[PDB]
Amino acid sequence: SGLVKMSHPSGDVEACMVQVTCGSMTLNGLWLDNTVWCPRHVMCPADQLSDPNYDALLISMTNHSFSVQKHIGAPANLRVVGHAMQGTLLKLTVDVANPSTPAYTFTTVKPGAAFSVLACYNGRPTGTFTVVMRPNYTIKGSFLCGSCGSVGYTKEGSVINFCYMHQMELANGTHTGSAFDGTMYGAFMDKQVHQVQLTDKYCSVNVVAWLYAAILNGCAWFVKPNRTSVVSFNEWALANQFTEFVGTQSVDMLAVKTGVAIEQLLYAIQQLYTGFQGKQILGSTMLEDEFTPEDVNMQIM
Amino acid sequence: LVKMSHPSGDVEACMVQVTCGSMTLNGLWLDNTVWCPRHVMCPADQLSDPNYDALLISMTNHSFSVQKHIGAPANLRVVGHAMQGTLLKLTVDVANPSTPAYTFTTVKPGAAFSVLACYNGRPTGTFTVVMRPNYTIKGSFLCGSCGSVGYTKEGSVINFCYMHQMELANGTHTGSAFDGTMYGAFMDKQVHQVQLTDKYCSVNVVAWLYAAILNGCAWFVKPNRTSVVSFNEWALANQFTEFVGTQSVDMLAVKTGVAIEQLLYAIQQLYTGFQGKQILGSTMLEDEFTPEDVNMQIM
Ligand SMILES: CC(C)(C)[C@H](NC(=O)C(F)(F)F)C(=O)N1C[C@H]2[C@@H]([C@H]1C(=O)N[C@H](C=N)C[C@@H]1CCNC1=O)C2(C)C
Numbered sequence: 001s002g003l004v005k006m007s008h009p010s011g012d013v014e015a016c017m018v019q020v021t022c023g024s025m026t027l028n029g030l031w032l033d034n035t036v037w038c039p040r041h042v043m044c045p046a047d048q049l050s051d052p053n054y055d056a057l058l059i060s061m062t063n064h065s066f067s068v069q070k071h072i073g074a075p076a077n078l079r080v081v082g083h084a085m086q087g088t089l090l091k092l093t094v095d096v097a098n099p100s101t102p103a104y105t106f107t108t109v110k111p112g113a114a115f116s117v118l119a120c121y122n123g124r125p126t127g128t129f130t131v132v133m134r135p136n137y138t139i140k141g142s143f144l145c146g147s148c149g150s151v152g153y154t155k156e157g158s159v160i161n162f163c164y165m166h167q168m169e170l171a172n173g174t175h176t177g178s179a180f181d182g183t184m185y186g187a188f189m190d191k192q193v194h195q196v197q198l199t200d201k202y203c204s205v206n207v208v209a210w211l212y213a214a215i216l217n218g219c220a221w222f223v224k225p226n227r228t229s230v231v232s233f234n235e236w237a238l239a240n241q242f243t244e245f246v247g248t249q250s251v252d253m254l255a256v257k258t259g260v261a262i263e264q265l266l267y268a269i270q271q272l273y274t275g276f277q278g279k280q281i282l283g284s285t286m287l288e289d290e291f292t293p294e295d296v297n298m299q300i301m
Numbered sequence: 302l303v304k305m306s307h308p309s310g311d312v313e314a315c316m317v318q319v320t321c322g323s324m325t326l327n328g329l330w331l332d333n334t335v336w337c338p339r340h341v342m343c344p345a346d347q348l349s350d351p352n353y354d355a356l357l358i359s360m361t362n363h364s365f366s367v368q369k370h371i372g373a374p375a376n377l378r379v380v381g382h383a384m385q386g387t388l389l390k391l392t393v394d395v396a397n398p399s400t401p402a403y404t405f406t407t408v409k410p411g412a413a414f415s416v417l418a419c420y421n422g423r424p425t426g427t428f429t430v431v432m433r434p435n436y437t438i439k440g441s442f443l444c445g446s447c448g449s450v451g452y453t454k455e456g457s458v459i460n461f462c463y464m465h466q467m468e469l470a471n472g473t474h475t476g477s478a479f480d481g482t483m484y485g486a487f488m489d490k491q492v493h494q495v496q497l498t499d500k501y502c503s504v505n506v507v508a509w510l511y512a513a514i515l516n517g518c519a520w521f522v523k524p525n526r527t528s529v530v531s532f533n534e535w536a537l538a539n540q541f542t543e544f545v546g547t548q549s550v551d552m553l554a555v556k557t558g559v560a561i562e563q564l565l566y567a568i569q570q571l572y573t574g575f576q577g578k579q580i581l582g583s584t585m586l587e588d589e590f591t592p593e594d595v596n597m598q599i600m
Contacts, residue, residue, distance in 0.1 A: 007426065014310040127305045
């Protein structure tokens, strides 16, 4: 069917991973120029992790409280000379700028958008994969203990956009983290207390993209003349666990290429949601919302 | 359970662009050798059935050009060309300073490897595939992707196992092992070629059922068992591969209590239909996760 889960080559980001340690707590960090980023629950002792006091934990610290090492590529003479708190992240200043710092930005990711994740353990990259920010502001990653501070990113021209630093696993196999302004996706708390997510929805625009990808690979039995307006679809969606459909130029390109209108697919989504009646789309019997329109454009062209 | 692949920095440092006349594609730069698919020598017109022996003869001392775009750029000087099955070994006068420790393996069907997709010698994407029972992969490759490289990483050693060569009649792909021989014996020539029928990788379906049981979804576990011998006889007539168990599958059986043979019987049932229910959110047998996947990701 042509659609694999593709990630950005991780070499750029691999060169920026470090191990942050704070006493005997240790996790992963991002070394960009003279700054190391890592989640702030590294100051916390396991005992006090159930209801900690980060401002208290912070004034407790000085530069000497933190140690940063680099285990990958050229070794790791790193002296912390500054430290600040920023939302749920620590902002350490180190005395050596990273020579491997890529061109980069900090931007928050919206639901339905896809990014690449570099899973790291003790400052060592181990695996990469790709996730879609869910409507309930979680991601379904593969994160084992020691993975906090793993980094999520997308790439533009030469510009890496860092968008996600791992922090937590909720009661399902479900993860959340921070943007690089310190805020947490979905407003979860970096405290080991029971926290429930909101119910998830389908990303409508991605389901439309996948449907276009089927029409592009000669699977179009679900296409009829009938149409549902966008405004009509978004009303129906509020009551059916579906996100507002918001069009883009990527979607529009697929509409022109296949010659099938958005409104035709919004209608089909409404019929396929009640069940495929035992037929198959691209090898599947359920709606798929993990491929963005940009992905279909890249892979199917 | 996510489709997860090896971080690619090491392999990115070995990708280069090989150029021959008016043809260009990717190559791999190890020590003093650049590997790449031999049809770089074939003019676009004459791919229909080429004479690779003649083409290598017609090569001169500057018929090949190799550029490194990633990292510190460089023009590498070719100082010798050899063929080996469906690959060229070009010798260059500079050794890749970023050559990692590597080996040249050949994936058996069912095995998963990481792919680094390149265009014009620049990496653009990485994904993971399982070598299919019919020796194709379901990749995402466009034109210019030839010479893209598949690998696994045992410890700190990179196991190079695939160099990409062609797209078959469906959206399916195949390429060379690094001994120059093409998975599935497809030919590097532009002709219609028949792939054999695919099959489910029995041991991966077994792995996936274990990942279900590990995650609470154990409804399909009845006390009935089918023996490996029995199942294998059944597989020959139900599009399944011969089951060959491993120490990795045994880990899943020990940390679970369910025997390999119970799940072999379950597969004979689930093949007929899920009877309404679902396993890990699915209504079909999943066979793209290996026992090592389930071990690593549900430790
Ligand atoms: C798809 C096409 C009809 C063009 C053809 N297929 C068959 O000829 C078949 F029918 F035999 F398979 C085919 O792939 N090629 C024709 C010619 C080389 C190869 C080729 O251009 N390969 C590129 C990788 N080296 C990548 C391709 C580009 C499209 N997507 C890919 O992955 C050789 C087989 C020697």
